[PDB]
Amino acid sequence: KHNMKAFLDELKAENIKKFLYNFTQIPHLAGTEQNFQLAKQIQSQWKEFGLDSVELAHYDVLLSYPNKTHPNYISIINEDGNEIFNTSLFEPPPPGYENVSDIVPPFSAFSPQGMPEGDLVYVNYARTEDFFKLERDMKINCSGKIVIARYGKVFRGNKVKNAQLAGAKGVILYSDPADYFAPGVKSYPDGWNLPGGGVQRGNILNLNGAGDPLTPGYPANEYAYRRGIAEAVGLPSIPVHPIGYYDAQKLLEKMGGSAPPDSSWRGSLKVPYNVGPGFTGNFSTQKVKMHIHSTNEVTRIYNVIGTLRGAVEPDRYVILGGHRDSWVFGGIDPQSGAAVVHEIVRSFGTLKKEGWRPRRTILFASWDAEEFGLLGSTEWAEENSRLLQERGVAYINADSSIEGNYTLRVDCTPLMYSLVHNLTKELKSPDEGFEGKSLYESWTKKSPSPEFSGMPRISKLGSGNDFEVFFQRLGIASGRARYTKNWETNKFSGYPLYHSVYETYELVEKFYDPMFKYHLTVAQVRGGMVFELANSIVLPFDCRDYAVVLRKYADKIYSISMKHPQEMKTYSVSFDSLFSAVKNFTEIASKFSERLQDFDKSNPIVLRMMNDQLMFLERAFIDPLGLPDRPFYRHVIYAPSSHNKYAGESFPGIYDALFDIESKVDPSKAWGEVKRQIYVAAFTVQAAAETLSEVA
């Protein structure tokens, strides 16, 4: 028969392996011919796999590339203006790829051009709190300095924004062995650690959900009217360049000025980690000079969109999407995800050729230009926003299936918590020592919930991937699942070879997943979720799980405010409305759940009415006015952190109103805005609750 088990049993580790090899032999950088050729290949294969239609959706977006005949690099210059040390022009290519053409050298995409020259200040991870420590506690002024920051902890675009706001005239980003070299493991090609010549590529935009910097709000189609570059969204104002730890050692070893303030500022290199500014006595007349010549260029990109039409509710869409573009070979990011999507489409297509169709329509997407700011997913969603907001049931992301081989890592809306628990209880653990046990059992053992015994950790959605437009702009229930490494403290830093030329097929096959069993398990989780969302008669969302988390978030935000009890008295700052709304949501959700299990199961209108109530529940948390100064982050419960795009923040409007409030010059105005955000949150929670009330 044609059920979830038939779907899941058709998925094969060996196919995922074959696909990963196929997708990682040459670079697939967004906007390049090689990436268009792969788009055409996946379009052809998805048609052959059995999808009803498979189309390319193209857009012309702003991208950024180094100048091939004018390379980017950093120097130390002496007082004569001789360049006495230069950083590398490329990463040493991996064995057997030293003749591959078109490997883009390391660069920070969207850096402006410039040749700034100055003294270095070391800023640790360039986090908001690192800059607070420098300016407020240490009294070090970054104005007109070049800052050097280690990668890790937060999205690199936030580091750049923080350095600009501190008055830096350039930023150097580097990978410290403390963050990218696990003790006791060898460097690539002999292990999975970053070598000293390896460098992490990546964009440094602050788009806040806008998509293409030139066309915020509207798709970058053939007649689009573009902003001028001076009005573009999210571009950095100062030059930025990334380097490896061999080169960083050379820039850091001569650093003078103040000692590091404590040990959380010292990495693993044999240098003092002095903060500066500038070099010690003998070298105090030497300076650092950047040479950045990259150009921004409007360039065509291509999404592949595959449709499997639903048999009963073809106007309800379940979307499985992940990106195809890579920095170089994309052995983990993104092709370990794309190979999994490819096998899922193949399995669904096998069932379709046997006469089966899902209840609801399934859309499959291979997005382009994710690495340049989620551009392909965002432009397509802008083009199709009316269809998505009235018809979109759920979005399941599918970037890298593995970033480690320890346990599962899931981030999703609370509406999917019960679905994920139930599905993982029905899947076999691939883990050593859990033979014969469920994935739920191994995952719960290795990643326990901080709040509940016998349950696994599930995190908030932040951003930094292609679910952002669907979840934070449009309010479509979204989720993601992948295998990860131990110690989720380091989760925002990436794995050691992230965005380097060393992320290859061989890396995955030799060091991560030789039997492709972790890939297979992740295919069963993502595919199983899509199967349930597209086939369950009642949508598999539990509104009571939202009620639980809303109380947790309300307790958390109240606790932050209560660090300022005198101000809460003076300005009559009350959270009563917010707790009332959460209480009401809890009561209404409980009654709705009772009707959902009781309602006349023979009545397809009451069913679809109740399915519409479940589908539009995530949508109810959207505020059409957006969050302050971030018009494309419209979800009132969740937004990417203003300090770290990768992290989700709960009740973000109230959180940002409270952040560093003790430093605001006009406290009455500042606390007025806290009160306004409490009203907006309490109203939105109550409005969302009321969508679950009886409809008339």
Next chain:
Amino acid sequence: KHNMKAFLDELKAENIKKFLYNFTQIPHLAGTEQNFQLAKQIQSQWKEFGLDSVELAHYDVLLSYPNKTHPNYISIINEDGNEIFNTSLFEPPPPGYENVSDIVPPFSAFSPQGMPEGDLVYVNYARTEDFFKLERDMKINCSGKIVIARYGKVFRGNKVKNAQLAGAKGVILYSDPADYFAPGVKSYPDGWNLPGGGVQRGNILNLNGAGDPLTPGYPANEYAYRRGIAEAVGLPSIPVHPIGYYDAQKLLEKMGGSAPPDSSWRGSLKVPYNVGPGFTGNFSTQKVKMHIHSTNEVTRIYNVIGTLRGAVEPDRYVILGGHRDSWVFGGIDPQSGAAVVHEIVRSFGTLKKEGWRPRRTILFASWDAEEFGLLGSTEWAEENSRLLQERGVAYINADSSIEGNYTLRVDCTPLMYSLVHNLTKELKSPDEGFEGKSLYESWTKKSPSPEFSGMPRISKLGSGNDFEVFFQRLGIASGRARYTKNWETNKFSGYPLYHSVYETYELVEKFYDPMFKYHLTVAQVRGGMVFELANSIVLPFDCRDYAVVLRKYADKIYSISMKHPQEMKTYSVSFDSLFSAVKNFTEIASKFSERLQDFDKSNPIVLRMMNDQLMFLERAFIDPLGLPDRPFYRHVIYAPSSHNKYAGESFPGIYDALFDIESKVDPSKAWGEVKRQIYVAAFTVQAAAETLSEVA
């Protein structure tokens, strides 16, 4: 049986008459006790009439009232500062009402306080083109002058905005007999003309759809956080007061300076209509002084919301709404509408008591505070926006049923054109000389379409009534219908006794509609529309009618642009994308219409899928970013005119970008913005078209 004919036959002229008398014996000013008492009465009666639930929804909004012990008035002062002439403190009350308490004296709601003193400039109707003529052609400077303007042609808030922008320090509004005294008709109480002591009340806000000035975006509930008055939306900065033509004659008779520029500036009073500034030689040292002491006050208002639950689609809402608050007795505005709504609810309730229910849910609303800026409808829609945008099928307004007795006047979305044609063909004309003929026949004869032989005129929706939030903010298909007077050239000026103490029951019964036959016909049109919208199996919308009008609007906007052919060449301004989108909409709508008539009529999912496509078609014209500087006008095809809130403008984003473009100092920038608006319009039309495509 229980069909539309049973509904329509139950409606009685005599009941409408009884209700109108009942609703007009005492003033029902928003925020007053008398108006709360009437809300409670209508709640009780709607329950007794048979509705499933009837609730009050209350809000606390900014309202404005004169000071009872410090009256507003205008003077002419001599050089000694003696007040030699004062305007009236009240309108002489009508016969038998001279002892009615709490008649609010004439005032302009939301005027600031002030006692400005200066020279008068006469500005005709204070339209954008009147100010253009004064400053540009006549070289008259209004800076620091008091302007005097006649009512008519455009909404009074636009006059006030125009006077402020010209630098006026006060505005005097008056009713000229040219606009408010029909030749050969007697003054009230002997006829329906405005007496010389009659004065038109009315608010002078420029809200642009915001609702309560203190809470834009969110309902003014019990925990709302308000803006300070300095940040309130839409308040005027200069004092404003209205007067009758006896008083206006006294202010205008001494006017000197320049002669009127032509005869379209002269009204019917025996004065020169000199433009000023100031008075002629002998009186040149006299000035005009305003004394305004009104206060703005947050005040509770109450909407009555009645529900008749649908039998098959209870989660689909058809709304019939109109306001209850009046300036004084509200004999025409609004109680001639409210009495009709009351009889419609009574008829629906009779059918319900016999076991009938409509297919879809019908919501009935008695809105408060319409006269102070559409506040009650807008706050309720802000509170319920998530429910309305996912479930709202249609909104039918119900302000005054009659403003004349000549023929029908309909404004609606093109989606309702076919519904209105079909219904009026099935109704009897009440008109003299059309006995035995259809309403369609009399209406088409008296108000022919400017474009099509054998069809009636149907106008665009503008604003100035409670449909605004539903149609221009939320994108719910909306319509309105009433009986009107001849010569629709004067349609924006009102009938002579509009917003005066003389609008009484006696006015309607003696002079407008003694047999209540025009009221009955309007009840059959509004009720018949609500019946069809709530009961037709397929929603009674024809998307092909939108396609026709979109081509007309595209031709019109292209023609405006083509007055500037040299600029269109220089800046490559092309309308090709917009015409392409309209062509595509036309083709897709045609194919959708074919499926709608062909689809398997036994399949309720294809039906509801296709009903959802019809319901969300109006919704597709909403841009979540709004129009420039008008965030609550989000419909891209229609917005209230920026020059006249009562008039609708088509493709408003392009129209406003083109308006007076030859006067912009930076033509490249100005034409860039025209091109941006063409892209937005072309994109939105294509996106709306695509919602009618096959769904997968």
